[PDB]
Amino acid sequence: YSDELRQRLAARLEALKENG
């Protein structure tokens, strides 16, 4: 079971704030 996918979902959001 890979609970890494969801970490990728949130990670992009964080970079959106820094780069927005």
SS (H, E, C) the chain: CCCCHHHHHHHHHHHHHHCC
CA distance 16 to 8: 13
Residue 9 is which amino acid?
A: L
18's tokens:
């820094």
CA distance 20 to 12: 12
Q: What is the dihedral of CA 13, 15, 16, 18, to 10 degrees?
A: 130
Method of determination is NMR
Burial of 17 (C-beta count, 10 Å sphere; 0-12/13-18/19+): exposed
